[PDB]
C-alpha cells in the first residue's frame, strides 16, 4: 500500500510541475515543455529538486532535512 | 610435561593477569568451531526478513513455491519458536 | 606493470568494490544502478577505443545521472523565468505551491 | 530552506583553512584546524553521514589533533541532488561500513598489517642511538 | 531528447485509505493474510515493469481491497480493534509486545466472526 | 550522627529527579498525551509523515481511526 | 517548549553539582570521625551558596602576561562539554534521542582533554605544563580502555542507542553478564576524571570545578545505565527516574568512599597498571564478547 | 637494527610494491603506496645520524604530498565517473594531478630536487634500494594509464628531467649525487616513450635496473663515496676499477654495450611515431651524462692517482663478505646487445 | 557539479598551497598535510553517500587510518629532527644540498 | 535544529556565566599590584594514536554480527584483535612501556 501511494504521489507532483512548466514556459522561444535530459525512454527516478523545485521553502526544507534533524 | 606444568604454576603466581588474559583469548578462539549453536545463529541471521520478498511469476512448474503464506510450501520457522 | 594475479587464480581480492552494481549488502541499489549496468553491458568485450566511440550515449546518460548538470540547468532556467514573471507580475503561484493544497498519503 | 546552510558551512570550512594555512604560531593553526574539523563534521552530519561524521569527530579530533597539540606543547544549489526514496528499516551507511568484515577481508588484512608495521616503524625510529 | 509522458490527475484519483500508521500496524498481519493476492500482483508488476506509470490499475485494486478489509473490520470487530490500535498508538515504538492481551482479544473476535 | 548527611543527598535526589520527569511530562504534553514517536531507520519517519498528511491538521499525533474510513 | 526542556535539564545539574560538594564533605567528615559543614545553614545546606558567592566576589588572578584567549576559552569548552554530555542519556526518555548516542558520549570525553591542554599551556609556567601533559597522557590512555570496554559491552546490546540498553536489561542487570568489564570500566571512569587514587593534580577555577563534578555525576549515571538497568513502565516513567537517580547517587557515594579509603598511585604506577593489566584483560574479554553471542546463538536483534 | 626487523621491513616494502602492481582498485593502489612509504623510512635511517634523518624527513614530506595529490586525483575521477577500476582516467583535470603525483613519486623534473639530497643523506645500500626498487610501482601505474596521459605534459617533463640530470651531473664530486642525477635522466628517458610504447619503457627499466645494481654493488665493494676515495681503488683491486669503467661506458650508451639498447629502441619507436626533433635533442643531451661518466672513469681507472702509505696494510686483507649476482649483473649490463630482439617477450 | 564540491576543492588547494609555502615550523607543514587529508575525507564521504554506493562506505575509514599513521610517522620524524637541532625550524635542514 | 539549539544554549550559558564570574570581582577597585623534552610522553602519545586507529577499525562490530557470514566476520574480528594484542606485546617486549 505504501509503495502504491508513493508512486501515485510522485506522479501527481510531477504532473503539477509539468502543468506549471507549461504555464511559465509559454513565451520562451526554444523551450520544449516536458523534455527529457536522458536519451533513453526508460523511467528515471526524480530528484528532490524536481518534485519540490517550485514549492514553498518550508516543505522543501522538511522533505530534505527533517529525518536527519528529527531527534 | 613436567616443565610445562611448572611453567604454568610459576606464571599463575606473580602473573595472574596475563594467564587469565591468554586463557580467555585462547578459549574464545577455539570454542566457536566446536559449538553447535553457531549454525543456529547463522540460520537466525538468514531467517530475518529485511527486504520485501518479491513474488515469482507463476508458470505451473514450481511445486516448492507457495501460492499463499499460509500454504505449507516454503521455509518454516518453527525451530526458532521452539528455541 | 599490471600482474593480473586475481583472474589467474580466480581470487576476487578487490573487484567487489569497483562498481555500483556488484553485490551490494542487503541488495541496496545504487542511485545510478540502471545507467551503469547499461553502460557496462554496452562496453563489455569491445575495447576501450571502441567503447568510447560507440557507447557514448550510455556514458552520457550515466554521467547525467551521476552529476545531474543538465537537470540543474533546466530547473535553474525555469526558476529564473518564474522569478522574472512574478517580479513583473503576470504570474501567480497556484495553491499547490503555496502550501494551501490537500495532501495525500 | 535556511539560506543554504550547507553553503554557509562550506564557506566557514574554507575560511578556517585560510586561517590555519597562513601558519601563524602553530598552536593557533592547530585551533584553526579543530575549528575546521568541527565544521567538516557539521557538514557530514547534516548531509546524512552520522557514523562517518562521528568517526571523524572522535578519531581525528580526539586522537590525532590531540597528539599534535601534545607534541607542540612539549616543544616551544544544494538539497536538489538528494535522494527520493527511503533506506528500508536500517541505515545504509552503517551496514556498508559493517560489511568490512564480511566483504572487505583483503582491506582488513592489509590495514592490520600496515598498522603493525607502523608500530614497528615508530619504535625503530624513536629508538635513536 | 523526447517528452516524458505523465498520466493526468484524473488517472491518479482514488479513494485513499485515511487511517494512521498505528491502525495499519494493528491489523497488519490480518491485512497481509487476507489482501495478499492483489498486493502480490501489484508488487510483481512493480519489479517487472520497473515503471510506476505501468502499475496504476494494480494500485487502485490494492487500495480497494484494503478498503474492503477495513470495512469488514468496522462492520464486525470495531471496538476490540479500536482498543488494540489505541494501545499500539500509545507506545512510541509501537510495540506488539506491550498488550498481547488486547491482541488476543482482537484475534479471538476476528476468528469467531470472520 | 550519620543521618545528618541525608538532607544534602535528598536535595541532590530532587535535583536529579527534575530532568527526567520534566522531559517525560514535556514529551507527553507535546505529543497529544502519548509517548513521543521515536523514528530511526527512515521507515517510521515515513510513517510519521504519512500520519501528518492523513491527520488534516498537519500534526502526526492526531490519530485518525477506523471512523475515518467511511 | 524545547528551551524549557533544555533549561530544566541544565539548571538542576548545576544545583546537583553544587550540592554534591556539600555531600562529599559530609561523607568524608563522617568517615573521618567528624562532621561536615553544619554551621552555615540548618545542616550545612547554605554552604554551597556561601562558597559560590565568595568565589564570585574574589578577584581573579589573571597572570597579565599569558594569552587571555585560551585562558578564557578553556572553562567555556569544559563547561559546554560537561553540560552537553547530559542530553544523550535516557531517563527514561532522552532530551535528544540519537541513534549513535554512545559514540557521541565517547567523542565528548575525547574532546574533554583539550580543556586540560589549553589550561596548562596558557598558565605561562613550565611546571603546570608538565602537570597538564601528565594529565592528558593519563586521560587518553584510560579513554582507550573505556572505548574498548564500551564496544565490548554494547556487543550484547545490538547498537549504540542508549535507549535500547533499557530493553536489554529488562530481565537482568548487565553487571551479572560481565562483571570484570564493569570493574575495569569503574576504574577507568575513576582515572578519567582525575579522582583518587588517580588524582595527581576564582571564577574560572569554580568553572573547572563544576565541569569536573558534572563529568563525575554524568559518569556515574552512564555507568548505572550501562551496567545496572532499571525496569521501565511506559505508563509511569517516574519509577524508572527514581530508581535511576538512586543508582547514580549510590555510584557517586562509591566514588566518595573510594577517595576517602585509599592512598594514591604514582604516575608511572598507574600507567603500568593500565598498559599491563587492563589492556590485556580488555582485549581478551573483547574477543570473548565477540565470540559469545555467536557461540550461544544469542545475537542481539537490532541492526 | 635487528635482522628480523630489517627482513620484515624489506618484506613490507616489496609487498606494498606487489600490492600496487597486482591491484585493480585505486584504493588498493593507494594503500600499497602508503605501505611502501611507511616501510621505506626505517631503511633510510638504518645508520642513525643527522644526515639520514634529514634525508628521511625530506623523503617522507615529498612522498606524503605526492600520495595526497594522487588521492585527490582518484577522488575527482570518482566524482566525474563512479568508477574505481584503473582504466581510462575519464577527467582532464584528474589526469593532470595523477601525472604530477606519479612524477613526484618518480622524481621527474621539476619534482627532481629531493632525489640528490635523499641519495646523498642515506647509505649506499639504502641508495641502491631507493634507486632500483622504488621505481617499479609509479612506473607500473603510469603504464596502466598510458592511453590517458596528456602527451605534451609527459614529454615536456621527460625532456626537463633529461636536461636537468645531464646538467646537474657535471657539477658533482660525491658519487651518490651522480647516481641520483643519472637516475633522473634515465627516468626522463623512460617516461618519454610511455605514450608510444610501454614495452620500450619496461625494457629501459630493466636495463637501467641492471646497470645501476652493478654500479652500486661495485661502489659497495670498494668503500668509496667521493671521487678521491674512488681514485684509491686501483692500488688494491684494479679489477674493480676496470669493471666499473666498463660499466660506466655502458651507462653512457656507447655501442656495442648494453646501454645502447634502450636509447636505440626508444629513438626507433619515436621515429615510427613521426617524432624526429625530440630524439635528436635527447641524444645531444645524454652526451652530458656521457661526459661526466667519462670524467669519473678518468679519475677512477684510466689514470693512476697518488696513494697513501696506509694502503699497504689494506693490501694484506681480503674482502670478507662477498656479494652474489655481481658478475651476472655486470655481464647483463655490458654484453646483451646481440640479444636485443628478445625484447619481443614484452618483458 | 555543485558549489559544495567547489568549496571543498578550494579548501584542499588552500591547504596544499600552505604546505608548499614553508614560512617556517614544519609542525605547520604536518598540519597542512592533515588539513588536506580532512578535505579528502569530507569530499570522499559526500561523493560516496550522495550516490548511495554502499560498499564504498568502507573507504573513508581506511583513508583516515592510513593518513593518521602517516601523520604519526611525520610527528616522530619531526621529534627526532627537533631533538637533533633544538627546534623544528625548516632552514636547519640545509646540510644536504643539490 | 534541536541539537543545534541545545549546543547554542550550552555555549551561551557557559559564556554568560563565565563573563559574569570574570566581571563581578573586577568592578571594585583594588591595588592591582623548557629544554628537556622527555621522549616517553611522545612515545605514549603515539601509542595512544595507533591504538585509537585500531579501535576505530574495531568500532563497527555491533552491526557486523548480522552479515550471514558469521565465520568470516568472526575470523576477521579475531584477526584484528590478535594483531592489536601483537602490537601491544611487541611494544612491551622491547621496553616501549618504561618510565
Ligand atoms: C639486463 C637485461 C634484462 C635482464 C632481466 C632479468 C633476467 C632474469 C629474470 C628471471 C625470469 C624473469 C621472469 C620470470 C619467469 C616467469 C614469468 C612469466 O610468467 O610472466 C610473464 C611475463 O613475461 C616476462 O616479463 C618475460 C621475461 C623476459 C625478460 C628478459 C627480456 C630482455 C630482452 C633484452 C635484453 C636481453 C636479455 C638476455 C638474457 C637475460 C607473463 O607476462 P604477463 O603477466 O601476461 O604480461 C604482463 C606484462 N605486460 C603488462 C607488459 C603485458
Ligand atoms: C595463494 C597464495 C597463499 C600464500 C601467499 C600469501 C601472500 C601474503 C598473504 C596475503 C594473502 C592472504 C589471502 C586472503 C585474501 C582474502 C580472500 C580469500 O581469503 O577468501 C576469503 C575467505 O575468508 C576467510 O575467512 C579468509 C581467512 C584468511 C585470513 C587469516 C590470515 C591472514 C594472514 C595474511 C598475511 C597478514 C599478516 C601475517 C599474519 C600471520 C573470502 O571469504 P568468502 O566468504 O568466500 O567471500 C566473502 C564475499 N561474500 C560476502 C560474497 C561471501
Ligand atoms: C558537538 C557535536 C556536533 C554533532 C553532535 C550530534 C551528533 C548526532 O548524531 O546528531 C545528529 C542528528 C541526528 O542524527 P542520528 O543520531 O544519526 O539520528 C537521526 C535519525 N533519527 O541530527 C543532526 O545531525 C543535527 C546536527 C547536525 C548539524 C550540526 C552538527 C554540529 C556541528 C558542530 C560545529 C562546531 C564545532 C566547534 C569546534 C569544536 C572544537 C573543540
Ligand atoms: C548558588 C548561588 C551562588 C550565586 C553566585 C554568586 C553571585 C554573586 C553576587 C554578587 C552581588 C554583588 C556584589 C557587590 C559587592 C562587590 C564587592 C565589593 O564589596 O566592593 C566594594 C567596592 C569598594 O570600592 P572602593 O571602596 O570605592 O575602592 C576601594 C579600593 N581603593 O565598591 C563597589 O565597587 C560597589 C559596586 C556596586 C554594586 C552595587 C550593586 C549590587 C550588586 C548587584 C548585582 C550585580 C550582579 C548580579
Ligand atoms: C593464543 C591466544 C591469542 C590471543 C589471547 C591474548 C589476547 C590478549 C592477551 C595478550 C596481551 C599482550 C601480552 C603481552 C605479553 C608480554 C609478556 C612480558 O613481557 O611480561 C614479562 C613477564 O611476563 C611473563 O612472565 C611472560 C609470560 C607469562 C605467562 C603468559 C601466559 C602463558 C600461558 C598461560 C595460559 C595457558 C593457557 C590457558 C590455560 C589456563 C587453565 C584454564 C615481563 O613483565 P614486566 O612487567 O616487564 O616485569 C618486570 C618487573 N618484574
Ligand atoms: C567459561 C567461560 C568463562 C569466561 C571467563 C571469565 C572469567 C574472568 C575471571 C578473571 C577476572 C579478572 C578481571 C577483573 C579485573 C582485574 C584487574 C586487575 O587485575 O588489576 C589489579 C589492579 O587493580 C587495582 O589495584 C585498582 C584498584 C584501585 C582502587 C579501586 C577500588 C575498588 C573497590 C571499590 C568497589 C569497586 C566496584 C566495582 C564494580 C562497579 C560496578 C559498576 C591487579 O594489578 P596488581 O595488583 O598491581 O598486580 C600486578 C602485578 N602482579
- 3-state SS, chain G, equals CCHHHHHHHHHHHHHHHHHHHHHHHHHHHHHCCCCCCCCCCCCCCCHHHHHHHHHHHCCCCCCCCCCHHHHHHHHHHHHHHHHHCCCCCECCCECCCCCCHHHHHHHHHHHHHHHHHHHHHCCCCHHHHHHHHHHHHHHHHHHHHHHHHHHHHHCCCCCCCCCHHHHHCCCCCHHHHCHHHHHHHHHHHHHHCCCCCCCCCCHHHHHHHHHHHHHHHHHHHHHHHHHCCCCCCCCCHHHHHHHHHHHHHHHHHHHHHHHHHCCCCCHHHHHHHHHHHHHHHHHHHHHHHHHHHHHHCCCCCCC
Cα separation, G198 vs G267, whole angstroms:
8
Question: DSSP state, A54?
Answer: T
Residues 6+ apart with CB under 8 A from B78: none
User: What is the dihedral sign for C-alpha H88, H94, H95, H97?
Assistant: negative
The whole-angstrom separation of Cα A37 and Cα C56 is: 15
Other CB atoms within a 10 A radius of the CB of residue G9 amount to: 24
- E67–F contact, CB cutoff 8 A: yes
Could you tell me the three cell numbers for H292?
A: 661526466
Residue with cell 596558557: G122
Which letter does DSSP use for residue H338 in this model? T
Which residues, 6+ apart, have CB-to-CB distance to H203 below 8 Å? H261, H262, H265, H343, H347
Residue G176's Cβ-count burial label (10 Å; 0-12, 13-18, 19+) is exposed
Backbone angles phi, psi at B16, to 5 degrees: -75, -30
Query: Which whole-number Å values give the CA distances from H291 to H162, H176, H301, in the listed order?
Result: 14, 17, 15
Q: How far apart are the CA of H141 and the centre of ligand 2, in A?
A: 25
**CA-wise closest residue to G73 among H272, H263, J19, B43:** J19
CB D106 within 8 A of CB J19: no
The domain segmentation of chain J, as residue ranges, is 1-94
Cα gap I73→G94, rounded to integer Å: 42
Phi, psi of G90 (to 5 degrees): -100, 120
Domain count, chain F: 1
- Which of D95, H81, D101, H28 minimizes the C-alpha distance to C20? H81
Burial grade of H69 (CB within 10 A; 0-12, 13-18, 19 or more)? buried
**Selection from J46, I93, J50, D110 nearest residue H61 by Cα:** I93
Instruction: Give me the residues paired with residue H25 across strands.
Output: H85
Alpha helices in chain C (DSSP H): 5-9, 33-43, 48-54, 56-67, 69-88
- Is C103 within 8 Å of chain F by CB? yes
Quick one: which atom of ligand 3 is closest to the CA of A67?
Answer: 20
Q: Could you tell me which residues are beta bridge partners of residue A35?
A: E3
Buried b (16+ CB within 10 A) or exposed e, G243-255: bbbebbbebbbeb
Q: Which residues line ligand 2 (CB under 6 A)?
A: C 13; D 102-103, 105-106, 109, 113; J 69, 72, 75, 79
- Do the beta carbons of residue C51 and residue C42 sit within 8 Å? yes
Query: How deeply is B49 buried, as exposed, middle or buried, from its count of CB atoms within 10 A (0-12, 13-18, 19+)?
Result: exposed
Contact G52, G44 (CB under 8 A): no
The set of cell numbers assigned to H2 is 635487528
Beta bridge partner(s), residue H226: H174
b/e sequence H73-111, b meaning 16+ C-beta within 10 Å? bbbbbbbbbbbbebbbbbbeebbbbbbbbbbbbbbbbeb
- Cell 524536481: give the residue: A50
What residue segments make up the domains of chain D, in order of their start?
5-127
Smallest Cα–Cα separation from G302: which of C92, E83, H118, D91? D91
Ligand 6 neighbours, Cβ below 6 Å, are B 14, 17, 20, 24; G 175, 180, 182-184, 186-187, 197, 223, 227, 258, 262, 273, 277, 281
Mutate to test the interface with D, among G110, G120, G140, G294 (most CBs of D within 10 A): G110
Which residue, among F41, F45, F50, would best test binding to D if mutated, counting the most D CBs under 10 Å from its CB? F41
β-partners of residue D81 are none
* Cis peptide bond N-terminal to H256, omega within 30: yes
H/E element, H149: none
Structure letter (DSSP) for residue H300: I
Of residues G106, G105, G108, G129, the one with CA closest to residue G117: G129
Q: What is d(CA H298, CA H234) in angstroms, rounded to the nearest whole number?
A: 12
Whether D85 sits inside 8 A of A45 (CB atoms) is yes
For helices H151-168 and H92-106, what crossing angle results, to 10°?
A: 20
CA of H202 to the centre of ligand 1 (A): 9
d(Cα B76, Cα G249) in Å, to the nearest integer?
A: 50
Residue A57 phi, psi dihedral angles, 5° rounding? -65, -30
CB H258 within 8 A of CB H212: no
Name the architecture of domain J1-94: Up-down Bundle (1.20)
Cα separation, G78 vs G212, in Å, equals 8
Q: Which of H1, J35, I87, H61 is nearest to D127 (CA)?
A: H1
Interface chains of chain E (3 or more CB pairs under 8 Å):
A, B, C, F, G
I33: distance to nearest CA of chain D, Å?
Answer: 10
Degrees, nearest 5: CA angle G101-G229-G161: 20
Return the biggest CA–CA distance within chain G. Answer: 65
Q: Which ligand is nearest to the CA of D9?
A: 3
Ligand 5 atom closest to the CA of G279, numbered from 1: 11
| Method used to solve the structure | cryo-EM
Q: Give the closest of D81, D83, D99 to C25, CB-based.
A: D99
Task: Give the position of cell 590555519.
Answer: D20
Eight-class DSSP state of D65: I
Q: Which CATH architecture describes the domain D5-127?
A: Up-down Bundle (1.20)
Spatial CB neighbours of D9, under 8 Å, sequence gap ≥ 6: D39, D42, D43, D46
Q: In this structure, what C-alpha cell is assigned to residue J1?
A: 535544529
Closest protein CA for atom 20 of ligand 4: J28
Category of I96 on φ-ψ map: left (φ > 0), alpha (ψ -120 to 50) or beta:
beta
Nearest CA to ligand 1 atom 19: C3
Say how many Å lie between the CA of residue D112 and the centre of ligand 5: 22
Range of the domain at F19: 1-70
User: Which cell numbers in the block locate residue H332?
Assistant: 647483463
Residue carrying C-alpha cell 619534482 = H111
Q: At E3, give phi and psi (nearest 5°).
A: -120, 130
How many Å apart are CA H290 and CA D70, to the nearest integer? 52
| Residue of I41, I39, I12, I28 whose CA lies nearest to I75 | I28
CA distance G67 to H290: 61
Residue from B18, B20, B25, B31 to probe ligand 5 pocket by mutation (most atoms less than 8 Å from CB): B18
Chain D residues in contact with F40 by the CB 8 A cut-off are 91
3-state secondary structure of H303: coil
* Alpha-carbon Rg for chain C in angstroms: 23
Distance CA B9, CA B21 (A): 16
- Sign (positive/negative) of CA torsion H260, H263, H266, H271? negative
Do residues J78 and G290 make contact, with C-beta atoms less than 8 angstroms apart?
Answer: yes
Ligand 6 atom 2: the closest Cα is on which residue?
A: B24
Nearest-Cα residue of chain J relative to residue I69: J50
Cα(G222)–Cα(G224) distance, rounded to whole angstroms?
A: 5
Place of cell 515543455: A33
How much is the CA Rg of chain F, to the nearest whole Å?
20
CB atoms within 10 A of CB H36: 26
For ligand 1, what atom is nearest to the CA of residue H202?
51
What are the chain A neighbours of J3 within 8 Å (beta carbons)? Answer: 71
Q: Which residues of G121-153 are buried (b: 16+ CB within 10 A; e: fewer)?
A: bbbeeeeebbbbbbbbbbbbbbbbbbbbbbbbb
Closest residue by Cα to residue F44 from I46, I54, G97: G97
Which DSSP symbol is given to D60? I
Label residue H134 exposed, middle or buried (CB < 10 Å: 0-12, 13-18, 19+). buried
DSSP state for residue D129 in the 8-state scheme: -
Amino acid at each position: 500500500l505504501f509503495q502504491a501511494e508513493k508512486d501515485r504521489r510522485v506522479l501527481q507532483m510531477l504532473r503539477e510541475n509539468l502543468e506549471e512548466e507549461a504555464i511559465i514556459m509559454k513565451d520562451v522561444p526554444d523551450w520544449k515543455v516536458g523534455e527529457s535530459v536522458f536519451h533513453t525512454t526508460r523511467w528515471v527516478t526524480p530528484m528532490m529538486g524536481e518534485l519540490y523545485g517550485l514549492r514553498t521553502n518550508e516543505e522543501i526544507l522538511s522533505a530534505t532535512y527533517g529525518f536527519i534533524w528529527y531527534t | 610435561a613436567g616443565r610445562i606444568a611448572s611453567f604454568l604454576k610459576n606464571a599463575w603466581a606473580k602473573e595472574p593477569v596475563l594467564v587469565a588474559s591468554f586463557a580467555i583469548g585462547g578459549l574464545a578462539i577455539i570454542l566457536p568451531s566446536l559449538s553447535p549453536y553457531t549454525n543456529y545463529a547463522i540460520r537466525i541471521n538468514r531467517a530475518t526478513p529485511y527486504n520485501y520478498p518479491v513474488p515469482l511469476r507463476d508458470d505451473g512448474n514450481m511445486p516448492d513455491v507457495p501460492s499463499h503464506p499460509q500454504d505449507p510450501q516454503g521455509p518454516s520457522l518453527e525451530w526458532l519458536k521452539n528455541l | 606493470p599490471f600482474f593480473d594475479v586475481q583472474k589467474r587464480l580466480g581470487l576476487d581480492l578487490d573487484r567487489w568494490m569497483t562498481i555500483q552494481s556488484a553485490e551490494q549488502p542487503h541488495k541496496i541499489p545504487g542511485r545510478c544502478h540502471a545507467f551503469e549496468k547499461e553502460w557496462i553491458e554496452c562496453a563489455h568485450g569491445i575495447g576501450g577505443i571502441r567503447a568510447e566511440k560507440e557507447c557514448k550515449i550510455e556514458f552520457d546518460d550515466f554521467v547525467e545521472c551521476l552529476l545531474r548538470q543538465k537537470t540543474m540547468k533546466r530547473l535553474s532556467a525555469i526558476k529564473r523565468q518564474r522569478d522574472k514573471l512574478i517580479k513583473e507580475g503576470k504570474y501567480t503561484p497556484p495553491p499547490h505551491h503555496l502550501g494551501k493544497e490537500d495532501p495525500r498519503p | 530552506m535556511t539560506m543554504y546552510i550547507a553553503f554557509i558551512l562550506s564557506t566557514i570550512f574554507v575560511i578556517g583553512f585560510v586561517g590555519f594555512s597562513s601558519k601563524p604560531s602553530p598552536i593557533y593553526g592547530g585551533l584553526g584546524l579543530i575549528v575546521s574539523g568541527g565544521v567538516g563534521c557539521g557538514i557530514v552530519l547534516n548531509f546524512g553521514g552520522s557514523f562517518l561524521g562521528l568517526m571523524v569527530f572522535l578519531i581525528y579530533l580526539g586522537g590525532m589533533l590531540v597528539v599534535f597539540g601534545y607534541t607542540t606543547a612539549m616543544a616551544t544549489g544544494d538539497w536538489v541532488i538528494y535522494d527520493t526514496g527511503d533506506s528500508g528499516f536500517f541505515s545504509e551507511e552503517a551496514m556498508g561500513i559493517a560489511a568490512l568484515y564480511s566483504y572487505g577481508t583483503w582491506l582488513v588484512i592489509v590495514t592490520g598489517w600496515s598498522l603493525l608495521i607502523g608500530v614497528v616503524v615508530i619504535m625503530e625510529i624513536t629508538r635513536g642511538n | 531528447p523526447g517528452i516524458v509522458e505523465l498520466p493526468t490527475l484524473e488517472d491518479l484519483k482514488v479513494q485513499e485509505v485515511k487511517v494512521s500508521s498505528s491502525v495499519l500496524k494493528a491489523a497488519a498481519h490480518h491485512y497481509g493474510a487476507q489482501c495478499d493476492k492483489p498486493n502480490k500482483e501489484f508488487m510483481l508488476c512493480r519489479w517487472e515493469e520497473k515503471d510506476p506509470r505501468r502499475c496504476l490499475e494494480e494500485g487502485k485494486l490494492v487500495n480497494q481491497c484494503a478498503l474492503d478489509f477495513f470495512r469488514q473490520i468496522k462492520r464486525h470487530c470495531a471496538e476490540p480493534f479500536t482498543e488494540y490500535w489505541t494501545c499500539i498508538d500509545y507506545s512510541g515504538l509501537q510495540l506488539f509486545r506491550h498488550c498481547r492481551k488486547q491482541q488476543a482479544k482482537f484475534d479471538e473476535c476476528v476468528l469467531d466472526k470472520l | 550522627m550519620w543521618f545528618e548527611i541525608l538532607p544534602g543527598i535528598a536535595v541532590m535526589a530532587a535535583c536529579l529527579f527534575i530532568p527526567g520527569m520534566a522531559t517525560a511530562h514535556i514529551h507527553k504534553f507535546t505529543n497529544g498525551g502519548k509517548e513521543k514517536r521515536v523514528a530511526h531507520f527512515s521507515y517510521q519517519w515515513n510513517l510519521m509523515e504519512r500520519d501528518r498528511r492523513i491527520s488534516g491538521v498537519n500534526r502526526y499525533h492526531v490519530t485518525k481511526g477506523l471512523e475515518n474510513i467511511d | 517548549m524545547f528551551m524549557i526542556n533544555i533549561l530544566s535539564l541544565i539548571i538542576p545539574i548545576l544545583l546537583a553539582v553544587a550540592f554534591l560538594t556539600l555531600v562529599e564533605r559530609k561523607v568524608l567528615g563522617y568517615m573521618q570521625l567528624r562532621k561536615g559543614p553544619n554551621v552555615v545553614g540548618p545542616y550545612g545546606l547554605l554552604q554551597p551558596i556561601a562558597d559560590a558567592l565568595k568565589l564570585f566576589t574574589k578577584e581573579p588572578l589573571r597572570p597579565a602576561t599569558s594569552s587571555i584567549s585560551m585562558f578564557i576559552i578553556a572553562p567555556i569548552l569544559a563547561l559546554s562539554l560537561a553540560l552537553t554530555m547530559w542530553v544523550p542519556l535516557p531517563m527514561p526518555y532522552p532530551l535528544i534521542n540519537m541513534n549513535l548516542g554512545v559514540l557521541f558520549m565517547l567523542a565528548m570525553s575525547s574532546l574533554a582533554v583539550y580543556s586540560i591542554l589549553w589550561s596548562g599551556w596558557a598558565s605561562n609556567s613550565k611546571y603546570a605544563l608538565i602537570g597538564a601533559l601528565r594529565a592528558v597522557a593519563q586521560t587518553i590512555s584510560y579513554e582507550v580502555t573505556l572505548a574498548i570496554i564500551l564496544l565490548s559491552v554494547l556487543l550484547m546490546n545490538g547498537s549504540y542507542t542508549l535507549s535500547t540498553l533499557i530493553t536489554t536489561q529488562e530481565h537482568i542487570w548487565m553487571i551479572f553478564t560481565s562483571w570484570p568489564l564493569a570493574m575495569m570500566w569503574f576504574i577507568s571512569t575513576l582515572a578519567e576524571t582525575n579522582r583518587a587514587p588517580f588524582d595527581l593534580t576564582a571564577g574560572p577555577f569554580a568553572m573547572f570545578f563544576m565541569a569536573e563534578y558534572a563529568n563525575i555525576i554524568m559518569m556515574n549515571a552512564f555507568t548505572a545505565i550501562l551496567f545496572l538497568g532499571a525496569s521501565h513502565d511506559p505508563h509511569t516513567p517516574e519509577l524508572y527516574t527514581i530508581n535511576f537517580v538512586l543508582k547514580t547517587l549510590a555510584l557517586t557515594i562509591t566514588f566518595l568512599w573510594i577517595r576517602a579509603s585509599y592512598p594514591r598511585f604514582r604516575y608511572d604506577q598507574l600507567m603500568h597498571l593500565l598498559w599491563k593489566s587492563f589492556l590485556p584483560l580488555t582485549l581478551a574479554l573483547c574477543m570473548w564478547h565477540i565470540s559469545l553471542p555467536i557461540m550461544t546463538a544469542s545475537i542481539p536483534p537490532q541492526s | 637494527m635487528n635482522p628480523i626487523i630489517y627482513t620484515t621491513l624489506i618484506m613490507t616494502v616489496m609487498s606494498g610494491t606487489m600490492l600496487v602492481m597486482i591491484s585493480s582498485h585505486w584504493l588498493l593502489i593507494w594503500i600499497g603506496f602508503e605501505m611502501n612509504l611507511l616501510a621505506m623510512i626505517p631503511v633510510l635511517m638504518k645508520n642513525f645520524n643527522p644526515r639520514a634523518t634529514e634525508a628521511a624527513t625530506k623523503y617522507f614530506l615529498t612522498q606524503a604530498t605526492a600520495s595526497m595529490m594522487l588521492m585527490m586525483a582518484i577522488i575527482i575521477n570518482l566524482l566525474y565517473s563512479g568508477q574505481w577500476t584503473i582504466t581510462k582516467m575519464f577527467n582532464p583535470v584528474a589526469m593532470t594531478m595523477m601525472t604530477m603525483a606519479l612524477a613526484m613519486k618518480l622524481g621527474l623534473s621539476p619534482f627532481h630536487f629531493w632525489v640528490p639530497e635523499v641519495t646523498q643523506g642515506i647509505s649506499l645500500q639504502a641508495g641502491l634500494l631507493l634507486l632500483t626498487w622504488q621505481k617499479l610501482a609509479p612506473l607500473s601505474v603510469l603504464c596502466q594509464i598510458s592511453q590517458s596521459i596528456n602527451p605534451n605534459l609527459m614529454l615536456t617533463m621527460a625532456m626537463l628531467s633529461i636536461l636537468i640530470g645531464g646538467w646537474g651531473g657535471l657539477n658533482q664530486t660525491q658519487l651518490r649525487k651522480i647516481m641520483a642525477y643519472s637516475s633522473i635522466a634515465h627516468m626522463g628517458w623512460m617516461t618519454a616513450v610511455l605514450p608510444y610504447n610501454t614495452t620500450m619503457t619496461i625494457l629501459n627499466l630493466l636495463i637501467y635496473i641492471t646497470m645501476t645494481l652493478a654500479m652500486f654493488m661495485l661502489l659497495i665493494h670498494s668503500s668509496a663515496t667521493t671521487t678521491l676515495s674512488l681514485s684509491h681503488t686501483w692500488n688494491k683491486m684494479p679489477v674493480i676499477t676496470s669493471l666499473m669503467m666498463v660499466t660506466l661506458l655502458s651507462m653512457g650508451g656507447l655501442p656495442p654495450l648494453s646501454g645502447f639498447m634502450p636509447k636505440w629502441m626508444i629513438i626507433q619507436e619515436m621515429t615510427k611515431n613521426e617524432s624526429i626533433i625530440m630524439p635528436t635533442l635527447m641524444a645531444m643531451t645524454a652526451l652530458l651524462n656521457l661526459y661526466f661518466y667519462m670524467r669519473l672513469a678518468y679519475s677512477s681507472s684510466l689514470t693512476m692517482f697518488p696513494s697513501t702509505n696506509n694502503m699497504k696494510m689494506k693490501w694484506q686483507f681480503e674482502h670478507t663478505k662477498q656479494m652474489k649476482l655481481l658478475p651476472t649483473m655486470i655481464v647483463l649490463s655490458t654484453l646483451v646487445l646481440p640479444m636485443t630482439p628478445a625484447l619481443s617477450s614484452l618483458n | 557539479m555543485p558549489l559544495v564540491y567547489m568549496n571543498i576543492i578550494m579548501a584542499f588547494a588552500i591547504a596544499l598551497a600552505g604546505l608548499l609555502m614553508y614560512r617556517s615550523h614544519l609542525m605547520s607543514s604536518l598540519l597542512c598535510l592533515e588539513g588536506m587529508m580532512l578535505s579528502l575525507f569530507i569530499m570522499s564521504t559526500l561523493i560516496i553517500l550522495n550516490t548511495h554506493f554502499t560498499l564504498a562506505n568502507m573507504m573513508p575509514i581506511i583513508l583516515l587510518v592510513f593518513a593518521a599513521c602517516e601523520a604519526a610517522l611525520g610527528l616522530s620524524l619531526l621529534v627526532m629532527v627537533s631533538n637533533t637541532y633544538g627546534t623544528d625550524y625548516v632552514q636547519n635542514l640545509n646540510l644536504l644540498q643539490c | 535544529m534541536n541539537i543545534m539549539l541545545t549546543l547554542l544554549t550550552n555555549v551561551t550559558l557557559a559564556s554568560l556565566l563565565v563573563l559574569i564570574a570574570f566581571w563581578l570581582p573586577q568592578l571594585n577597585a583594588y591595588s592591582e599590584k623548557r629544554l628537556p623534552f622527555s621522549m616517553k610522553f611522545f612515545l605514549v602519545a603515539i601509542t595512544f594514536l595507533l591504538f585509537d586507529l585500531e579501535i576505530a577499525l574495531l568500532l563497527p562490530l555491533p552491526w557486523a554480527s548480522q552479515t550471514n557470514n558469521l565465520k568470516t566476520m568472526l575470523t576477521m574480528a579475531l584477526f584484528l584483535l590478535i594483531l592489536l594484542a601483537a602490537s601491544l606485546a611487541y611494544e612491551w617486549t622491547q621496553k616501549g612501556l618504561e618510565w
